[PDB]
From a paper:
Protein modifications by ubiquitin and Ubl (ubiquitin-like) proteins are involved in the regulation of most cellular pathways including cell cycle progression, transcription, DNA repair and stress responses, and their misregulation is implicated in cancer and aging. SUMO is recognized by short SIMs (SUMO-interaction motifs) that have specific consensus sequences and bind with medium to low affinity with dissociation constants in the range 1–100 μM.
In order to analyse the contribution of the four putative SIMs in [name] to the binding of SUMOylated substrates, we tested the interaction of full-length [name] and of a construct comprising the entire N-terminal part of [name] upstream of the RING domain (subsequently referred to as ‘SIM domain’) with mono-SUMO1 and mono-SUMO2 and with linear SUMO–SUMO fusion proteins of variable length. The last residue at the C-terminus of the first SUMO monomer in the proposed di-SUMO2 and the first N-terminal residue of the second SUMO monomer that are resolved in the structure are 14.1 Å (1 Å=0.1 nm) apart. The residues of this stretch can easily cover the distance of 14.1 Å in an extended form. Therefore a SUMO chain in solution is expected to be able to adopt multiple conformations to interact with the SIMs in unstructured regions of SUMO-binding proteins. Importantly, we found almost no difference in binding of the linear di-SUMO fusions compared with the binding affinity of ‘native’ Lys11-linked di-SUMO2 chains (KD=11 μM). This validates that linear SUMO fusions are a suitable model for poly-SUMOs and that the SIM domain of [name] recognizes the SUMO chain only via the established SUMO–SIM interaction and not by additional binding to the branching point at Lys11. Elongation of the SUMO chain to four moieties, however, resulted in a significant increase in affinity with a KD value of 4.3 μM for tetra-SUMO1 and 1.6 μM for tetra-SUMO2.
Author numbering:
A (entry chain A), B (entry chain A): 17 to 89
Write the structure that this text describes.
Amino acid sequence: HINLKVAGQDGSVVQFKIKRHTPLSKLMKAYCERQGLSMRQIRFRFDGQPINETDTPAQLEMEDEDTIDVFQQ
Amino acid sequence: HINLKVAGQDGSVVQFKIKRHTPLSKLMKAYCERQGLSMRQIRFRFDGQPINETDTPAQLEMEDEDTIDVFQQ
């Protein structure tokens, strides 16, 4: 498992742990659920790159304690 | 190539060959595949130390005919 932060533009930082070869849609759906947000209303990015359904941490070269940025659509 | 043993607690000894600067995750995945085992269920150690994804034999000072120990998680 790697630990990841999800930072909103309001400064909120919400924490997840994910295995390196698990798709990040696990984390994305979880965030939407936990935070009462529509998948429809938001996008997730890492190092500027948008994150897709099957993107994995290992594939986006994410490391423990890295930050994913969340935005409005 | 160096030859390595992978010993289970049941006494089984399964043989691999690996280059000294190749990551041991090559061998680990292979063992899981060959032996019908989940990465999830098991850990690998050498001389007491856990082995990570990118650990190499040369880096763990493994030599020809050395033994890696496998355990349940």
